[PDB]
Tab-separated table of C-alpha atoms and ligand atoms in Angstrom:
chain	number	residue	atom	x	y	z
A	28	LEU	CA	24.954	8.053	-15.850
A	29	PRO	CA	24.939	5.156	-14.087
A	30	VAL	CA	23.623	2.238	-16.412
A	31	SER	CA	22.730	-1.399	-15.022
A	32	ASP	CA	21.077	-4.687	-15.707
A	33	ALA	CA	19.469	-4.731	-12.235
A	34	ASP	CA	15.968	-6.753	-13.088
A	35	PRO	CA	14.477	-5.377	-9.937
A	36	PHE	CA	11.937	-7.986	-10.699
A	37	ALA	CA	13.359	-11.081	-10.897
A	38	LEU	CA	12.443	-13.177	-8.771
A	39	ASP	CA	15.217	-13.628	-6.594
A	40	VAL	CA	14.831	-9.322	-5.815
A	41	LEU	CA	11.266	-9.667	-4.768
A	42	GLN	CA	12.195	-12.512	-2.219
A	43	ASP	CA	14.859	-10.001	-1.133
A	44	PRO	CA	15.141	-6.185	-1.909
A	45	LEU	CA	17.589	-5.250	0.206
A	46	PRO	CA	20.762	-5.393	-0.783
A	47	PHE	CA	19.198	-4.057	-4.898
A	48	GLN	CA	18.306	-0.967	-2.601
A	49	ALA	CA	21.144	-0.556	-1.508
A	50	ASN	CA	22.895	-0.463	-4.844
A	51	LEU	CA	20.283	1.793	-6.423
A	52	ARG	CA	21.022	4.301	-3.871
A	53	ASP	CA	24.988	3.639	-4.215
A	54	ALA	CA	25.514	3.899	-7.219
A	55	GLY	CA	23.864	7.381	-8.095
A	56	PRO	CA	20.941	9.858	-7.368
A	57	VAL	CA	19.228	8.207	-11.426
A	58	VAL	CA	20.169	5.100	-12.801
A	59	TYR	CA	19.498	3.609	-16.073
A	60	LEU	CA	17.946	0.572	-15.967
A	61	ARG	CA	18.914	-0.678	-19.800
A	62	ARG	CA	15.955	-4.174	-19.053
A	63	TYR	CA	13.669	-1.395	-19.179
A	64	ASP	CA	14.390	1.435	-20.622
A	65	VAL	CA	13.364	3.485	-17.757
A	66	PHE	CA	14.983	5.623	-15.134
A	67	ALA	CA	15.535	4.686	-11.513
A	68	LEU	CA	15.632	6.939	-8.102
A	69	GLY	CA	16.314	4.880	-4.601
A	70	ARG	CA	17.403	8.106	-2.421
A	71	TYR	CA	14.671	9.716	-0.545
A	72	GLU	CA	15.740	13.632	-2.301
A	73	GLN	CA	14.853	12.636	-6.150
A	74	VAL	CA	12.073	9.898	-4.785
A	75	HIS	CA	9.607	12.958	-3.235
A	76	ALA	CA	10.468	15.493	-5.463
A	77	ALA	CA	9.480	12.964	-7.962
A	78	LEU	CA	5.982	12.474	-6.608
A	79	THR	CA	5.289	15.793	-6.063
A	80	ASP	CA	6.016	17.163	-9.113
A	81	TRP	CA	3.172	15.657	-11.223
A	82	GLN	CA	3.560	18.334	-14.056
A	83	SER	CA	6.944	16.501	-15.217
A	84	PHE	CA	6.226	13.464	-13.438
A	85	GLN	CA	2.633	12.520	-14.987
A	86	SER	CA	-0.529	9.498	-14.120
A	87	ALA	CA	-2.134	9.460	-16.867
A	88	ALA	CA	-0.238	7.249	-19.448
A	89	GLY	CA	0.055	4.621	-16.546
A	90	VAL	CA	1.868	4.191	-12.927
A	91	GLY	CA	2.792	0.953	-13.703
A	92	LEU	CA	5.829	-0.134	-16.309
A	93	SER	CA	3.629	-0.007	-19.286
A	94	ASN	CA	2.597	2.424	-21.051
A	95	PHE	CA	-0.893	3.364	-22.319
A	96	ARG	CA	0.527	5.895	-24.757
A	97	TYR	CA	1.271	2.153	-26.962
A	98	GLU	CA	-0.175	-0.910	-24.694
A	99	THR	CA	-4.394	-1.928	-24.192
A	100	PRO	CA	-4.332	-1.888	-19.762
A	101	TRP	CA	-5.681	-5.017	-18.288
A	102	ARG	CA	-8.615	-2.900	-16.636
A	103	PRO	CA	-10.149	0.113	-17.400
A	104	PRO	CA	-7.474	2.413	-15.299
A	105	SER	CA	-8.211	4.620	-12.400
A	106	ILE	CA	-9.747	7.632	-12.249
A	107	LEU	CA	-7.348	8.349	-9.320
A	108	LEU	CA	-4.214	6.767	-9.517
A	109	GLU	CA	-4.251	7.144	-13.198
A	110	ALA	CA	-5.544	10.172	-13.727
A	111	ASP	CA	-4.148	13.622	-13.540
A	112	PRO	CA	-5.065	17.497	-12.848
A	113	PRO	CA	-8.320	19.009	-13.610
A	114	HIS	CA	-9.679	14.880	-14.622
A	115	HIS	CA	-7.591	13.762	-11.386
A	116	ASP	CA	-9.576	16.150	-8.615
A	117	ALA	CA	-13.265	15.540	-8.394
A	118	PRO	CA	-12.869	11.927	-7.676
A	119	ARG	CA	-9.606	12.571	-5.169
A	120	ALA	CA	-12.009	15.730	-2.881
A	121	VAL	CA	-14.662	12.620	-2.887
A	122	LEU	CA	-12.341	9.790	-1.377
A	123	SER	CA	-10.430	12.601	0.382
A	124	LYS	CA	-13.558	13.402	2.451
A	125	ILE	CA	-15.305	10.113	2.928
A	126	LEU	CA	-11.979	8.818	4.313
A	127	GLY	CA	-10.949	11.831	6.094
A	128	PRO	CA	-10.197	11.806	9.977
A	129	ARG	CA	-14.100	13.016	11.300
A	130	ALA	CA	-15.601	11.125	8.324
A	131	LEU	CA	-13.912	7.596	10.530
A	132	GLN	CA	-14.514	8.700	14.451
A	133	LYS	CA	-18.121	6.968	13.626
A	134	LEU	CA	-16.006	4.141	12.658
A	135	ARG	CA	-13.457	4.302	15.742
A	136	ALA	CA	-15.433	1.905	18.257
A	137	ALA	CA	-17.029	-0.736	16.075
A	138	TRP	CA	-13.363	-1.207	14.753
A	139	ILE	CA	-11.747	-1.536	17.684
A	140	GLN	CA	-15.225	-3.652	19.353
A	141	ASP	CA	-14.041	-6.097	16.109
A	142	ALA	CA	-10.897	-6.083	16.766
A	143	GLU	CA	-11.147	-7.545	20.219
A	144	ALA	CA	-14.037	-9.955	19.276
A	145	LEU	CA	-11.263	-10.978	16.731
A	146	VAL	CA	-8.536	-10.860	19.511
A	147	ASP	CA	-10.290	-12.329	22.205
A	148	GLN	CA	-12.017	-16.198	20.049
A	149	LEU	CA	-8.441	-16.308	18.372
A	150	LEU	CA	-6.835	-16.092	22.205
A	151	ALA	CA	-9.654	-18.455	23.889
A	152	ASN	CA	-8.790	-20.979	21.074
A	153	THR	CA	-5.017	-20.738	20.372
A	154	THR	CA	-1.259	-19.242	22.065
A	155	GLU	CA	0.286	-19.632	18.337
A	156	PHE	CA	-0.590	-19.013	15.637
A	157	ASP	CA	-0.484	-17.280	12.634
A	158	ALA	CA	0.387	-13.501	12.377
A	159	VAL	CA	-1.226	-13.513	8.777
A	160	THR	CA	-4.548	-15.809	8.278
A	161	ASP	CA	-5.644	-14.891	11.563
A	162	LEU	CA	-4.940	-11.182	12.063
A	163	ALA	CA	-3.824	-9.697	9.516
A	164	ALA	CA	-5.485	-10.445	6.543
A	165	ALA	CA	-8.896	-11.489	9.174
A	166	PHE	CA	-9.040	-7.876	10.694
A	167	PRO	CA	-9.662	-6.091	7.553
A	168	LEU	CA	-11.880	-8.508	6.024
A	169	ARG	CA	-14.068	-8.114	8.796
A	170	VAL	CA	-14.087	-4.303	8.825
A	171	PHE	CA	-12.942	-2.632	5.204
A	172	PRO	CA	-15.577	-4.068	2.829
A	173	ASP	CA	-18.724	-3.925	5.601
A	174	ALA	CA	-17.755	-0.748	5.733
A	175	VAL	CA	-17.337	-0.137	1.760
A	176	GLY	CA	-21.206	-1.855	2.262
A	177	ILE	CA	-20.754	-4.787	-0.377
A	178	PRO	CA	-21.739	-7.574	-0.107
A	179	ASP	CA	-20.567	-10.829	1.561
A	180	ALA	CA	-20.619	-12.999	-1.671
A	181	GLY	CA	-17.621	-13.052	-3.858
A	182	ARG	CA	-15.352	-11.600	-0.695
A	183	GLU	CA	-12.948	-14.511	-1.597
A	184	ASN	CA	-12.100	-12.130	-4.601
A	185	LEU	CA	-10.528	-9.776	-2.724
A	186	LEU	CA	-6.792	-10.770	-2.262
A	187	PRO	CA	-6.313	-11.839	-5.733
A	188	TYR	CA	-8.131	-8.642	-7.625
A	189	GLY	CA	-5.263	-5.899	-5.648
A	190	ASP	CA	-2.964	-8.819	-6.093
A	191	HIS	CA	-3.493	-9.299	-9.601
A	192	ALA	CA	-3.385	-5.373	-10.162
A	193	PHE	CA	-0.514	-5.388	-7.312
A	194	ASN	CA	1.585	-7.646	-10.087
A	195	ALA	CA	-0.090	-5.685	-13.362
A	196	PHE	CA	2.154	-2.763	-12.337
A	197	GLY	CA	5.265	-5.033	-12.997
A	198	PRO	CA	6.671	-6.650	-16.594
A	199	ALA	CA	4.090	-9.520	-17.786
A	200	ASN	CA	6.174	-11.614	-16.103
A	201	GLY	CA	4.811	-15.036	-15.080
A	202	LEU	CA	3.593	-13.539	-11.816
A	203	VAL	CA	1.282	-11.598	-13.975
A	204	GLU	CA	1.121	-14.162	-16.619
A	205	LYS	CA	-0.347	-17.006	-14.190
A	206	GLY	CA	-3.039	-14.218	-12.972
A	207	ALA	CA	-4.473	-13.272	-16.817
A	208	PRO	CA	-6.883	-16.611	-16.993
A	209	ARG	CA	-8.782	-15.012	-13.874
A	210	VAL	CA	-9.090	-11.304	-14.630
A	211	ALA	CA	-12.274	-11.573	-16.467
A	212	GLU	CA	-13.916	-13.287	-13.458
A	213	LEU	CA	-11.828	-10.929	-11.138
A	214	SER	CA	-12.630	-7.944	-12.799
A	215	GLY	CA	-16.811	-9.283	-14.009
A	216	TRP	CA	-16.529	-9.472	-9.804
A	217	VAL	CA	-15.630	-6.271	-9.199
A	218	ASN	CA	-17.266	-4.302	-11.550
A	219	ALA	CA	-20.946	-5.958	-9.967
A	220	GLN	CA	-19.936	-4.972	-6.766
A	221	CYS	CA	-19.322	-1.269	-8.088
A	222	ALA	CA	-22.667	-0.895	-8.828
A	223	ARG	CA	-25.403	1.457	-6.458
A	224	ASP	CA	-28.108	-1.308	-5.988
A	225	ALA	CA	-25.270	-3.746	-4.705
A	226	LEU	CA	-24.271	-1.603	-1.911
A	227	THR	CA	-25.864	-0.501	1.616
A	228	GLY	CA	-26.945	2.625	2.468
A	229	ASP	CA	-24.691	3.742	4.236
A	230	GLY	CA	-21.201	2.521	3.509
A	231	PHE	CA	-18.509	4.668	1.657
A	232	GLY	CA	-20.191	2.885	-1.304
A	233	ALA	CA	-23.920	4.992	-0.960
A	234	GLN	CA	-21.522	8.311	0.285
A	235	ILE	CA	-19.685	8.213	-3.174
A	236	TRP	CA	-22.649	7.999	-4.826
A	237	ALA	CA	-24.459	10.572	-3.050
A	238	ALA	CA	-21.805	12.640	-4.106
A	239	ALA	CA	-22.524	11.876	-7.856
A	240	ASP	CA	-26.155	12.884	-6.489
A	241	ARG	CA	-24.895	16.439	-5.161
A	242	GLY	CA	-22.866	16.489	-8.822
A	243	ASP	CA	-19.301	16.625	-6.948
A	244	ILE	CA	-18.588	13.721	-9.741
A	245	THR	CA	-20.660	11.865	-12.513
A	246	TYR	CA	-22.858	7.898	-11.714
A	247	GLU	CA	-19.938	7.347	-14.753
A	248	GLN	CA	-17.327	8.150	-12.294
A	249	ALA	CA	-19.258	6.837	-8.794
A	250	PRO	CA	-18.900	2.886	-9.514
A	251	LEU	CA	-14.544	3.043	-10.710
A	252	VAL	CA	-14.307	5.578	-7.449
A	253	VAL	CA	-15.619	2.578	-5.278
A	254	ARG	CA	-13.602	0.415	-7.763
A	255	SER	CA	-10.604	1.950	-5.974
A	256	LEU	CA	-11.453	1.171	-2.478
A	257	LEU	CA	-11.859	-2.517	-3.345
A	258	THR	CA	-8.420	-2.605	-5.808
A	259	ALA	CA	-6.288	-0.272	-2.937
A	260	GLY	CA	-8.306	-0.726	-0.443
A	261	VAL	CA	-7.643	-4.399	0.939
A	262	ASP	CA	-4.422	-5.967	0.153
A	263	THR	CA	-2.025	-3.006	1.711
A	264	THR	CA	-3.268	-3.050	4.685
A	265	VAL	CA	-3.001	-6.667	4.906
A	266	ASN	CA	0.408	-6.293	4.595
A	267	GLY	CA	1.002	-3.138	6.576
A	268	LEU	CA	-0.702	-5.334	9.452
A	269	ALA	CA	1.688	-8.204	9.053
A	270	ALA	CA	4.766	-5.533	9.258
A	271	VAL	CA	4.204	-4.090	12.124
A	272	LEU	CA	2.887	-7.630	13.644
A	273	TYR	CA	5.904	-9.143	12.423
A	274	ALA	CA	8.639	-6.189	14.320
A	275	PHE	CA	6.686	-6.011	17.443
A	276	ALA	CA	6.931	-10.286	16.841
A	277	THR	CA	10.918	-9.011	16.689
A	278	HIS	CA	11.049	-5.879	18.788
A	279	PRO	CA	10.238	-7.093	22.758
A	280	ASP	CA	11.296	-3.409	23.592
A	281	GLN	CA	9.027	-1.884	21.281
A	282	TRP	CA	5.962	-4.232	21.471
A	283	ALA	CA	6.175	-2.938	25.631
A	284	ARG	CA	6.549	0.738	24.842
A	285	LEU	CA	3.266	-0.116	22.842
A	286	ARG	CA	1.499	-1.799	26.083
A	287	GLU	CA	2.806	0.850	27.960
A	288	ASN	CA	1.182	4.239	25.558
A	289	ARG	CA	-1.625	2.974	23.647
A	290	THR	CA	-1.508	5.646	21.629
A	291	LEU	CA	1.869	4.392	19.991
A	292	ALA	CA	-0.477	2.415	17.516
A	293	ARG	CA	-0.162	5.453	14.878
A	294	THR	CA	3.068	6.088	14.431
A	295	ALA	CA	3.797	2.656	15.176
A	296	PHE	CA	1.873	1.541	11.850
A	297	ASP	CA	3.223	4.610	9.997
A	298	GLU	CA	7.389	3.068	11.227
A	299	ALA	CA	6.096	-0.157	9.701
A	300	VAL	CA	5.058	1.357	6.629
A	301	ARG	CA	8.909	3.527	6.207
A	302	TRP	CA	9.946	0.207	6.923
A	303	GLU	CA	8.731	-2.159	5.474
A	304	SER	CA	7.509	0.169	2.952
A	305	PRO	CA	4.406	-2.514	1.954
A	306	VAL	CA	4.554	-0.645	-1.913
A	307	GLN	CA	7.846	-1.060	-2.864
A	308	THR	CA	7.468	0.715	-6.411
A	309	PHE	CA	5.524	2.824	-8.604
A	310	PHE	CA	6.280	4.723	-12.041
A	311	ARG	CA	5.689	7.666	-13.535
A	312	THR	CA	5.866	9.359	-17.323
A	313	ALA	CA	8.072	12.559	-18.263
A	314	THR	CA	5.685	15.186	-20.095
A	315	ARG	CA	9.142	17.421	-21.139
A	316	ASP	CA	12.693	16.580	-20.681
A	317	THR	CA	13.234	17.371	-16.659
A	318	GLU	CA	16.399	17.325	-14.449
A	319	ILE	CA	16.336	15.604	-11.611
A	320	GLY	CA	18.933	13.826	-9.229
A	321	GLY	CA	21.784	15.457	-12.078
A	322	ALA	CA	19.907	13.810	-14.953
A	323	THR	CA	17.635	14.860	-17.999
A	324	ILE	CA	15.022	12.288	-18.316
A	325	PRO	CA	13.605	12.766	-21.547
A	326	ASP	CA	10.465	13.227	-22.389
A	327	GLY	CA	7.992	10.513	-22.645
A	328	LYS	CA	10.218	8.316	-20.421
A	329	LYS	CA	9.079	6.153	-17.674
A	330	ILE	CA	10.679	7.340	-14.056
A	331	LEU	CA	10.410	4.544	-11.774
A	332	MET	CA	11.001	5.846	-8.169
A	333	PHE	CA	11.848	3.156	-5.288
A	334	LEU	CA	9.591	3.775	-2.696
A	335	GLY	CA	10.898	1.289	-0.449
A	336	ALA	CA	14.441	2.527	-0.656
A	337	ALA	CA	13.943	6.197	-0.501
A	338	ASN	CA	12.841	4.838	3.708
A	339	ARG	CA	15.674	3.273	4.048
A	340	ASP	CA	17.579	6.307	2.488
A	341	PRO	CA	20.595	6.558	5.422
A	342	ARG	CA	19.798	10.119	3.582
A	343	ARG	CA	17.031	10.831	5.436
A	344	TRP	CA	17.044	8.358	8.064
A	345	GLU	CA	19.515	7.465	11.190
A	346	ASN	CA	19.836	3.656	10.860
A	347	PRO	CA	17.518	2.869	8.919
A	348	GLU	CA	17.226	-0.300	8.332
A	349	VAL	CA	15.732	-0.358	12.342
A	350	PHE	CA	12.198	-0.083	13.556
A	351	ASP	CA	12.346	2.189	16.275
A	352	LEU	CA	8.247	3.524	17.330
A	353	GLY	CA	10.723	6.343	19.608
A	354	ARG	CA	11.861	7.989	15.450
A	355	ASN	CA	9.619	9.982	14.054
A	356	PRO	CA	8.728	8.408	10.505
A	357	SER	CA	7.369	11.650	9.202
A	358	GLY	CA	8.026	12.637	6.035
A	359	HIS	CA	8.401	8.580	4.786
A	360	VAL	CA	6.815	8.037	1.330
A	361	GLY	CA	5.190	4.358	2.227
A	362	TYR	CA	1.829	6.676	1.169
A	363	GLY	CA	3.855	8.596	-1.574
A	364	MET	CA	3.517	12.229	-1.335
A	365	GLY	CA	1.865	15.978	-3.185
A	366	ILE	CA	-1.371	15.182	-5.175
A	367	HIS	CA	-1.172	11.572	-5.330
A	368	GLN	CA	-0.708	10.513	-1.223
A	369	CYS	CA	-2.579	7.584	-0.378
A	370	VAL	CA	-6.406	8.631	0.715
A	371	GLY	CA	-6.216	5.765	2.623
A	372	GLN	CA	-3.985	5.879	5.337
A	373	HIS	CA	-6.704	7.343	7.830
A	374	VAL	CA	-8.189	4.031	7.626
A	375	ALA	CA	-5.175	2.424	7.534
A	376	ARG	CA	-3.902	4.120	10.575
A	377	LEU	CA	-7.519	3.793	12.663
A	378	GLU	CA	-7.332	-0.637	11.403
A	379	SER	CA	-4.023	-0.687	13.356
A	380	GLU	CA	-5.078	1.504	16.005
A	381	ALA	CA	-8.534	-1.207	16.781
A	382	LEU	CA	-5.987	-4.632	16.070
A	383	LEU	CA	-2.879	-3.469	18.435
A	384	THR	CA	-5.144	-1.868	21.439
A	385	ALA	CA	-7.213	-5.332	21.008
A	386	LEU	CA	-3.945	-7.415	20.725
A	387	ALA	CA	-1.903	-5.834	23.686
A	388	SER	CA	-4.535	-5.379	25.926
A	389	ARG	CA	-4.421	-9.092	25.878
A	390	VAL	CA	-0.903	-10.091	25.272
A	391	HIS	CA	2.379	-9.844	27.712
A	392	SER	CA	4.822	-10.635	24.987
A	393	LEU	CA	4.625	-11.896	21.711
A	394	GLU	CA	7.587	-13.961	19.541
A	395	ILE	CA	8.243	-15.657	16.179
A	396	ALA	CA	7.393	-19.159	16.377
A	397	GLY	CA	8.419	-21.020	13.217
A	398	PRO	CA	9.717	-19.769	9.821
A	399	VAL	CA	8.451	-16.879	7.619
A	400	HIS	CA	7.305	-16.640	4.453
A	401	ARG	CA	6.871	-14.079	2.252
A	402	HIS	CA	4.199	-13.635	-0.811
A	403	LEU	CA	6.261	-12.816	-4.390
A	404	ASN	CA	4.762	-9.856	-6.265
A	405	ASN	CA	6.513	-7.124	-8.333
A	406	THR	CA	4.836	-3.619	-6.409
A	407	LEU	CA	3.309	-4.717	-3.039
A	408	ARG	CA	5.392	-6.453	-0.080
A	409	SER	CA	3.428	-9.052	0.841
A	410	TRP	CA	3.776	-11.759	3.608
A	411	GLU	CA	2.435	-15.643	3.620
A	412	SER	CA	2.664	-16.668	6.411
A	413	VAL	CA	3.778	-14.951	10.822
A	414	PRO	CA	3.861	-17.979	12.645
A	415	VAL	CA	3.619	-16.348	16.829
A	416	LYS	CA	3.512	-17.932	19.668
A	417	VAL	CA	2.073	-15.171	22.565
A	418	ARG	CA	2.540	-15.094	26.181
A	419	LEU	CA	-1.104	-13.958	28.228
A	420	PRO	CA	-0.438	-12.439	31.455
B	1	HEM	C1	-0.639	0.889	4.246
B	1	HEM	C2	-1.845	0.861	3.857
B	1	HEM	C3	-1.538	1.724	2.043
B	1	HEM	C4	0.071	1.685	1.909
B	1	HEM	C5	0.632	1.215	2.072
B	1	HEM	C6	-1.024	2.640	0.167
B	1	HEM	C7	-0.491	2.877	-0.457
B	1	HEM	C8	-0.193	3.978	-1.764
B	1	HEM	C9	0.670	5.402	-2.004
B	1	HEM	C10	2.042	4.592	-2.257
B	1	HEM	C11	-0.262	5.415	-2.838
B	1	HEM	C12	-0.229	6.784	-4.305
B	1	HEM	C13	0.116	6.330	-5.257
B	1	HEM	C14	0.793	7.204	-6.211
B	1	HEM	O1	2.134	8.137	-5.871
B	1	HEM	O2	1.050	7.161	-7.540
B	1	HEM	C15	-1.141	5.282	-2.994
B	1	HEM	C16	-2.747	5.831	-3.173
B	1	HEM	C17	-3.679	5.418	-2.729
B	1	HEM	N1	-4.145	4.643	-1.942
B	1	HEM	FE1	-3.428	3.685	-0.872
B	1	HEM	N2	-2.005	2.914	0.787
B	1	HEM	C18	-3.383	2.030	1.822
B	1	HEM	C19	-3.560	2.134	2.479
B	1	HEM	C20	-4.385	2.436	1.655
B	1	HEM	C21	-6.156	1.468	1.772
B	1	HEM	C22	-6.667	1.244	3.280
B	1	HEM	C23	-6.599	2.462	0.451
B	1	HEM	C24	-8.485	2.384	1.381
B	1	HEM	C25	-9.144	3.584	1.383
B	1	HEM	C26	-6.292	3.189	-0.335
B	1	HEM	C27	-6.448	3.469	-2.039
B	1	HEM	C28	-5.716	4.483	-2.358
B	1	HEM	C29	-6.019	5.428	-3.954
B	1	HEM	C30	-7.618	5.175	-3.931
B	1	HEM	C31	-5.151	5.908	-4.090
B	1	HEM	C32	-5.068	6.781	-5.388
B	1	HEM	C33	-4.800	8.237	-4.376
B	1	HEM	C34	-4.954	8.885	-5.977
B	1	HEM	O3	-3.972	8.723	-6.991
B	1	HEM	O4	-5.319	10.493	-5.354
B	1	HEM	N3	-5.379	3.007	0.085
B	1	HEM	N4	-1.745	4.808	-1.574
B	2	ANN	C1	-1.910	2.417	-3.994
B	2	ANN	O1	-1.946	1.644	-4.980
B	2	ANN	C2	-3.861	1.922	-5.491
B	2	ANN	C3	-3.696	0.860	-6.600
B	2	ANN	C4	-5.294	0.870	-6.875
B	2	ANN	C5	-6.110	2.064	-7.132
B	2	ANN	C6	-7.167	2.456	-7.630
B	2	ANN	O2	-7.021	1.729	-8.569
B	2	ANN	O3	-7.503	3.209	-7.599
B	2	ANN	C7	-5.082	3.424	-6.223
B	2	ANN	C8	-4.019	2.941	-5.440
């Protein structure tokens, strides 16, 4: 069995994980990380197998490093992300209906419009700006908390709350331990936005509580289902949006292709999600001795699935390092796969469709205007700054 002292949460790897990914894939289907006592998977075949096989690889012992068999969770674990069937089934089906295609139809014209207002206002002021702060961060914060229906107070908690959650899936290293004094306040705030009386009458929050009225979920589940939205719903889309913007800023032919066919927006965003893989890793825990990639994972031990690695595995993807909207990215594991696969993907895509359409409407060409800067995180590939210069027609 290949065994390694590689630390996937070291600051150098988080800054640039592409060499670790390629070594993981090259070493074997399964690599034992001695540092953490887990089994790493980097190739698509095994990452796909592990994601779908919920019977062998459970989530309820936690999908971070931390094993809830023994360790105290930093918060009450997610009743979606960290629940197996049957407990998973009810809250899943509620979000699945609420965030599904049909349901989102009603928000499309609003979100297109908000995107056009954000872009018009930005462009009236500057032709050069940061795509992170001015676009990728700014647009989800305009539309998404409003669609959930939380109030305006404490909205500055959304990004740190998400950040901390994604960090907290990794080891108790400095990125988690620096977050840990501010947890109580961060948690205090989020719980407070999940109550029925904190939410507007019509948003996703409202609809979650309406599902509880019908007995789809309990009144005890209702706030934690809202909480999933406020953990997973913001940071991921910001980083997905910074990735596709960075890609278009770096790929003038691909930008022209979008401008020729605006219906390419959905597939543009999915290709960014494959190529960037905003969520890089998750854990599962083996329920039995299970054989994957030629290796036996003992009952009770954790696997580490490298989504980013699988999404650039050349066994599944031709020339994987390339961002190409010509590629069919369908089958990427950037949203996961099987019963836990991202229930917010219709939201992500509509966001990208709105923003991309607004941008392409006004912007002849786009380039990188300055150094790019990452924001380090144990689990989430985060962008801090993407300076861009746009040329108006
Ligand atoms: C680009 C954006 C996004 C990425 C890259 C992403 C990624 C993921 C991945 C990889 C999973 C699978 C978890 C696992 O298998 O253990 C997932 C699940 C989930 N995502 Fe997303 N996500 C994104 C956007 C969103 C949005 C906008 C929401 C808001 C609705 C959301 C809510 C969730 C929830 C609740 C789950 C857990 C579902 C379950 O366990 O059944 N995500 N996401
Ligand atoms: C993909 O990341 C997440 C993170 C948190 C949750 C949750 O809190 O429900 C779901 C998905």
